[PDB]
Amino acid sequence: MPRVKAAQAGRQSSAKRHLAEQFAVGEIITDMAKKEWKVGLPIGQGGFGCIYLADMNSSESVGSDAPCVVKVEPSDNGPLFTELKFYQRAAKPEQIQKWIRTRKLKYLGVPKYWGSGLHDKNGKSYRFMIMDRFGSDLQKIYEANAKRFSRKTVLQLSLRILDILEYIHEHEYVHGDIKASNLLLNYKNPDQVYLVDYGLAYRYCPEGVHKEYKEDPKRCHDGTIEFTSIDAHNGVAPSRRGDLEILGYCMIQWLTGHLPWEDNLKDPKYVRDSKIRYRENIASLMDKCFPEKNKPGEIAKYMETVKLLDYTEKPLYENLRDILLQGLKAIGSKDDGKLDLSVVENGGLKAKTITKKRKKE
C-alpha cells in the first residue's frame, strides 16, 4: 500500500530533476513518413512513458475511441528503439499484407505500423511510435478466471501462434516472448488474437550464419526464470529449441493451471534441475501433473518432439500439427470455441524487443 509500503525511487543513480512535458490536445504532428496524426487527450498510468490518443488527419476533435495510439519514451532507451525498429521493419503494411497473400489466409494477427516522431530539447531527445488500438491482454483474463483455461482455448492459440512463429522464424528472427502477457485481442474482432510487445525479438542468423551451439551468456540472457529458455539458463547461444520451449512451458501452464516449479522460483538452481530432470523423463511431468486416468497424448508427443530435437534438425510444424488435430479427434471434440477471451480491459502498454538487460553499457 502507498502508506504502508514505501516506494523507493533510487539511492544513487540519477541526479537533478528531469521533468518531462506533453503535447496540446487537438494537435497533429508530422511523422517521419510525412503522415499527419492528431493527438487527443492523455490515457494511461505510469509517468514518463504515458500513452496518448491518436487518429488520422480527418476532422473535428478526438473522442474516447481513437483508432491508433501513440507512446512517448526516452530516445536514449534501447529496448524501445527495437520495438519501433522491428515494427517499421517487420510490422510493415506490405510485409504483413504480402504474407496473407503468400499464405492464402484471411488476415494477419500481427500489429500494423503507422509512424513516429522525435524532438530534441536542451540536449534531451524524445521519441514516440504510433500503433493501433487493442481490446485486452490474454494474461489479464487468465488471472481473472483464477488461472483456468480450456482445451479448445489453449489448442486454439497453439495453432495461431505457430503460423505467427513461422513468419518471424523465416525472417531469421527469434520470438522469445510468446507468453500471453504479450498478446491481445481485436476490439472489433474478439476472435482475433494479436501478438504485440515482443521484448525479446532477436536474429541469430546474420549473413546466412546460423548461430551454432556455443557459450554466449552475454547474449540472449534477458528473461524471467518463469519461462527463461534453457539456452540462457546454461549460458549457451540462441537456438531454435528455445522458442518451442517457451510455448511448451506456458502450453502446459494453462492446460494444467500451475507448474511444478511454481513455489520454488526463488531457487534458480532448482528450476534448472527440474528442467533437465523433466526433460529426460517427460512422461513423469504428465504423470505428476495429470492423473493416470487422463494422459493427453497431444502434450506427450509435443514434448517428445522438443526434447528429441537436434541443433541441426529443422522445425517439424507438419508433424506437430498432426498431433494437435489428433488431440481433439481423440477426445471426440472439435474447434468449437475459438479465442474465447472477449471482455476488454486496457490500462497501458509496453514497447521493447531487445534481450540483454543486466548492466547496460
Q: Is 29 annotated as a binding residue?
A: no
For residue 355 the three cell numbers come to 534481450
**Between vectors from CA 307 to CA 223 and to CA 182, what angle results, nearest 5°?**
30
Annotated catalytic residues are 177
Q: Is 51 annotated as a binding residue?
A: yes
Question: Which class for 118: exposed (0-12), middle (13-18), buried (19 or more C-beta within 10 A)?
Answer: exposed
- φ, ψ dihedrals at 53, nearest 5°: -60, 140
Helix (H, G, I), strand (E, B) or coil at 151: helix
Helix (H, G, I), strand (E, B) or coil at 130: strand
Q: Is 28 annotated as a binding residue?
A: no
What is the sign, positive or negative, of the torsion defined by CA atoms of 89, 91, 94, 99? positive
Q: Is 71 annotated as a binding residue?
A: yes
Domains and CATH numbers, the chain: 1-134 (3.30.200.20), 135-361 (1.10.510.10)
Distance CA 154, CA 328 (A): 12
* Amino acid at position 281, single letter: N
Helix (H, G, I), strand (E, B) or coil at 207: helix
Alpha-carbon torsion angle 184, 188, 190, 195, nearest 10 = -20
Q: Is 46 annotated as a binding residue?
A: yes
Contacts for 234 with CB less than 8 Å, ≥ 6 apart: 272
CB 99 within 8 A of CB 321: no
Experimental method: NMR
Residue with cell 495453432: 159
Distance CA 181, CA 214 (A): 30
Q: Which long-range contacts (CB under 8 A, 24 or more apart) does 324-332 make?
A: 324/155, 324/158, 324/159, 324/298, 326/297, 326/298, 327/151, 327/155, 327/296, 327/297, 327/298, 328/151, 328/152, 328/155, 330/297, 330/298, 331/151
The length of the chain is 361
Distance CA 161, CA 222 (A): 21
* Amino acid at position 269, single letter: K
Three-state SS for 176-196 is CCCCHHHEEECCCCCCCEEEC
Helix (H, G, I), strand (E, B) or coil at 37: strand
The neighbour count for residue 10, using CB atoms within 10 Å, is: 7
CB 72 within 8 A of CB 49: yes
CB 302 within 8 A of CB 251: yes
For residue 310 the three cell numbers come to 537436434
Residue with cell 513423469: 284
- Radius of gyration of the CA atoms of the chain, in A: 22
- φ, ψ dihedrals at 51, nearest 5°: -105, 145
Among 158, 143, 139, residue whose Cα is nearest residue 197: 139
Question: Which class for 210: exposed (0-12), middle (13-18), buried (19 or more C-beta within 10 A)?
Answer: middle
* Amino acid at position 28, single letter: I
For residue 96 the three cell numbers come to 504483413
Q: Is 49 annotated as a binding residue?
A: yes
Which residues, in sequence order, are bridge partners of residue 202?
Answer: 174
- φ, ψ dihedrals at 302, nearest 5°: -55, -50
CB 342 within 8 A of CB 185: yes
Distance CA 233, CA 271 (A): 9
Which residues, in sequence order, are bridge partners of residue 119?
Answer: 126
Distance CA 173, CA 195 (A): 14
- Quote the crossing angle between the two packed helices 297-307 and 317-330, to the nearest 10°: 160
Question: Which class for 274: exposed (0-12), middle (13-18), buried (19 or more C-beta within 10 A)?
Answer: middle
Helix (H, G, I), strand (E, B) or coil at 282: helix
**Between vectors from CA 265 to CA 263 and to CA 266, what angle results, nearest 5°?**
110
CB 192 within 8 A of CB 346: no
Among 347, 352, 353, 354, residue whose Cα is nearest residue 51: 347
- φ, ψ dihedrals at 68, nearest 5°: -110, 160
Question: What distance lies between CA 29 and its chain's CA centroid?
Answer: 29
Distance CA 114, CA 30 (A): 12
**Helix H segments across the chain?**
79-90, 93-103, 138-144, 151-169, 230-234, 241-256, 268-280, 282-289, 297-307, 317-330
What is the sign, positive or negative, of the torsion defined by CA atoms of 20, 26, 27, 33? positive
For residue 255 the three cell numbers come to 492446460
Among 190, 191, 193, residue whose Cα is nearest residue 179: 193
Contacts for 82 with CB less than 8 Å, ≥ 6 apart: 198, 201, 352, 353, 354
Distance CA 247, CA 242 (A): 9
